[PDB]
Amino acid sequence: DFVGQTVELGELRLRVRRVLAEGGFAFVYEAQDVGSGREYALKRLLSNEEEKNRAIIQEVCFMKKLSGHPNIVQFCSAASIGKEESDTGQAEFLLLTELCKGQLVEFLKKMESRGPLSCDTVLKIFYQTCRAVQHMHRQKPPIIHRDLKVENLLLSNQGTIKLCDFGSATTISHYPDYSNFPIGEKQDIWALGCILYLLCFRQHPFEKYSIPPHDTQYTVFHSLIRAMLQVNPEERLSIAEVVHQLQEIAAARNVNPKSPITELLE
Amino acid sequence: QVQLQESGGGSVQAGGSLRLSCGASEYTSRMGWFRQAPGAEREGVACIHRQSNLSYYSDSVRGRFTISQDNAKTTAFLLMSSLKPEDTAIYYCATTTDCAAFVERATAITAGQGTQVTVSS
Numbered sequence: 001d002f003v004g005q006t007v008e009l010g011e012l013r014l015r016v017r018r019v020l021a022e023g024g025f026a027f028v029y030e031a032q033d034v035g036s037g038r039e040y041a042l043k044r045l046l047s048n049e050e051e052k053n054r055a056i057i058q059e060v061c062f063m064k065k066l067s068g069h070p071n072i073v074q075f076c077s078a079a080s081i082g083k084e085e086s087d088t089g090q091a092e093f094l095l096l097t098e099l100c101k102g103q104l105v106e107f108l109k110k111m112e113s114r115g116p117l118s119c120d121t122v123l124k125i126f127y128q129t130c131r132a133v134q135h136m137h138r139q140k141p142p143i144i145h146r147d148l149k150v151e152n153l154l155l156s157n158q159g160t161i162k163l164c165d166f167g168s169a170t171t172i173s174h175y176p177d178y179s180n181f182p183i184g185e186k187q188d189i190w191a192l193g194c195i196l197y198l199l200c201f202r203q204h205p206f207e208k209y210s211i212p213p214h215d216t217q218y219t220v221f222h223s224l225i226r227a228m229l230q231v232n233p234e235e236r237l238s239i240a241e242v243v244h245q246l247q248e249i250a251a252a253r254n255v256n257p258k259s260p261i262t263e264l265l266e
Numbered sequence: 267q268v269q270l271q272e273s274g275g276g277s278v279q280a281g282g283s284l285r286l287s288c289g290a291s292e293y294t295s296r297m298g299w300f301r302q303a304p305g306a307e308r309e310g311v312a313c314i315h316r317q318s319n320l321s322y323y324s325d326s327v328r329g330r331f332t333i334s335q336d337n338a339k340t341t342a343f344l345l346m347s348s349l350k351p352e353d354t355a356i357y358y359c360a361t362t363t364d365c366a367a368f369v370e371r372a373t374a375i376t377a378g379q380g381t382q383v384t385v386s387s
């Protein structure tokens with residue numbers, strides 16, 4: 001019973017239009033600035049515990065830092081209310097960002113009934129997902145996502161991929177402003193490998209794995225999947241190594257992989 | 267340290283072809299070449315990821331060089347075609363933990379003693 005209310009968030013006045021998503025910790029809402037008419041996604045996270053407080057605030061800090069990238073949702077604002085002040089009896093964290101058109105899976109469900117995903121479209125989805133992850137790995141220190149999966153990805157109004165779930169992300173605090181050691185990036189690449197496999201073959205590679213032996217549609221990706229699913233993390237590709245090859249694939253197919261994925265929009 | 271053994275290079279006429287080779291005393295996941303022209307920064311040129319056979323080039327040499335390896339994954343080969351004075355440099359074999367980083371910065375685990383490549387017009 002949170003929809004219908006108009007909520008202050010700094011000098012923004014926002015009417016809570018409807019529920020886009022739910023789950024455990026949080027709800028996400030479509031909201032509209034009453035004054036300007038502008039639309040946003042508003043994530044409300046409720047907390048009764050200090051540990052959840054830390055998790056929530058860390059997720060917001062991550063979103064602030066990573067905002068500004070084409071493939072990360074744009075952070076607009078955030079605010080809180082202590083327990084003394086809310087109609088939940090709980091700590092309330094409000095996160096405001098750009099509003100996206102929908103979850104990626106919803107669009108995948110609809111394309112599913114029009115054949116297998118075009119290789120070009122898989123390329124655009126994956127490249128854009130990988131550019132977001134590269135943006136996290138390029139931070140000094142690198143930000144590790146740790147829960148990459150296709151369900152968490154969104155599609156923006158402009159038809160590009162947007163990463164939105166930073167609640168499992170981690171990094172090193174108080175890093176001097178020398179080390180060039182791996183610190184978890186490679187787990188992210190494994191997760192990405194599973195996404196590429198999934199997007200191509202519409203199932204998870206594990207429940208050892210096996211690329212379908214007579215696939216002639218997604219052949220172009222086969223070596224990259226295997227390379228990203230190296231058991232040995234030192235042998236596994238970095239995101240720079242993955243993105244490099246994704247650009248070469250793109251060139252080979254004469255595709256702009258950063259362009260709007262307009263095949264998902266029809 | 268792995269022990270590297272380098273061959274090939276020397277002088278060639280512009281537009282021609284040279285081949286370099288490099289042998290490692292044991293297996294490594296990635297092998298490449300960087301070069302250094304006079305006064306310039308080190309420049310990652312080409313790199314191969316052995317288990318995948320995937321290969322990485324700098325913008326300067328893509329389309330003209332091809333890096334490849336032997337079946338035994340002990341050696342890399344660099345075929346350099348359509349060579350130009352810009353490609354005059356000392357070329358150093360190297361191992362790396364990351365071919366894309368290597369191609370961008372020449373960050374290496376260990377490097378060979380180098381071979382001279384000179385291209386005359």
Ligand SMILES: O=C1Nc2ccccc2/C1=C1/Nc2ccccc2/C1=N\OCC[C@@H](O)CO
Pocket residue numbers: 020021028040041043073097098099100101102103151152153154164165
């Ligand atoms: O436009 C959006 N900006 C955001 C910023 C943070 C979290 C979610 C969203 C979001 C969403 N826009 C839409 C539109 C339709 C359905 C769901 C949905 C969204 N987020 O859904 C959150 C679920 C995801 O986190 C799965 O783990």
